[PDB]
């Protein structure tokens, strides 16, 4: 089809005076709406940065990366911030929840900087709670609640902004087995109702799950591999 996100000859590294430390060497890679995507390799790959360049929090030093047809080197910190909102949730290993708001609180947060107004963030977030099978604990502050429970929450936080695009860090990395596989289930249904799932992890077990796998090796591209389930 059309893909949803391209990159061309991505290029990351971080200026030391002039000799570069090179992160990413050249990386090109189409994902597509709908697709689960798992991007895997150890500590120092590189894989975190792509990451981070995927969700707009970082910039490319070179190369091209559009996002729904949309060059992201063209835009200023406000439109960046806007295309983020429109396209891209993000989870991680840890929860990252404030610990003094409640669940649905948490939940509203990215809203508020969409300008969405305070009735209409709190109906929404209800409903991604509910969705997420937490329709008793909308209340409950993130200390009462388990880790796994935590984690459903940070990915209806994900979602409240739309969350086409969902990029997740090492998701299950902090769960037991049983809470890990619930996590995964609410991804796979995710993707099954046409989000763009992209999981980076650094166990191939993990990887084995999505539909295709890219493994990353000092900031390259070595291996690509299609799977079905």
Same mark, same amino acid.
């Given at each position: 089809?059309?893909?949803?996100? *391209?990159?061309? /000859?991505?290029?990351?590294?971080?200026?030391?005076? /002039?000799?570069?430390?090179?992160?990413?060497?050249?990386?090109?890679?189409?994902?597509?709406?709908?697709?689960?995507?798992?991007?895997?390799?150890?500590?120092?790959?590189?894989?975190?940065?792509?990451?981070?360049?995927?969700?707009?929090?970082?910039?490319?030093?070179?190369?091209?990366?559009?996002?729904?047809?949309?060059?992201?080197?063209?835009?200023?910190?406000?439109? #960046?911030?806007?295309?983020?909102?429109?396209?891209?949730?993000?989870?991680?290993?840890?929860?990252? #929840?404030?610990?003094?708001?409640?669940?649905?609180?948490?939940?509203?947060?990215?809203?508020?900087?969409?300008?969405?107004?305070?009735?209409?963030?709190? #109906?929404?977030?209800? *409903?991604?709670?509910?969705?997420?099978?937490?329709?008793?604990?909308?209340?409950?502050?993130?200390?009462?609640?388990?880790?796994?429970?935590?984690?459903?929450?940070?990915?209806?936080?994900?979602?409240?902004?739309?969350?086409?695009?969902?990029?997740?860090?090492?998701?299950?990395?902090?769960? /037991?087995?049983?809470?890990?596989?619930?996590?995964?289930?609410?991804?796979?249904?995710?993707?099954?109702?046409?989000?763009?799932?992209?999981?980076?992890?650094?166990?191939?077990?993990?990887?084995?799950?999505? *539909?295709?796998?890219?493994?990353?090796?000092?900031?390259?591209?070595?291996?690509?591999?299609?799977?079905?389930?």
């Amino acid at each position: 089809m059309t893909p949803l996100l *391209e990159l061309k /000859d991505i290029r990351r590294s971080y200026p030391a005076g /002039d000799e570069q430390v090179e992160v990413l060497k050249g990386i090109s890679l189409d994902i597509y709406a709908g697709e689960m995507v798992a991007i895997v390799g150890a500590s120092g790959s590189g894989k975190s940065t792509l990451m981070n360049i995927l969700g707009c929090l970082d910039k490319a030093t070179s190369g091209t990366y559009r996002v729904a047809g949309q060059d992201v080197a063209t835009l200023d910190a406000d439109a #960046l911030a806007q295309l983020r909102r429109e396209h891209f949730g993000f989870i991680f290993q840890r929860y990252h #929840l404030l610990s003094h708001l409640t669940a649905e609180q948490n939940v509203e947060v990215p809203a508020v900087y969409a300008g969405l107004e305070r009735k209409q963030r709190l #109906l929404r977030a209800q *409903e991604l709670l509910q969705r997420l099978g937490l329709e008793d604990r909308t209340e409950y502050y993130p200390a009462q609640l388990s880790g796994g429970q935590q984690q459903r929450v940070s990915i209806a936080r994900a979602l409240m902004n739309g969350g086409q695009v969902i990029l997740a860090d090492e998701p299950t990395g902090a769960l /037991d087995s049983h809470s890990g596989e619930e996590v995964m289930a609410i991804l796979h249904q995710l993707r099954d109702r046409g989000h763009t799932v992209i999981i980076v992890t650094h166990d191939p077990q993990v990887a084995a799950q999505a *539909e295709r796998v890219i493994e990353i090796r000092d900031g390259e591209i070595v291996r690509l591999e299609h799977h079905h389930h």
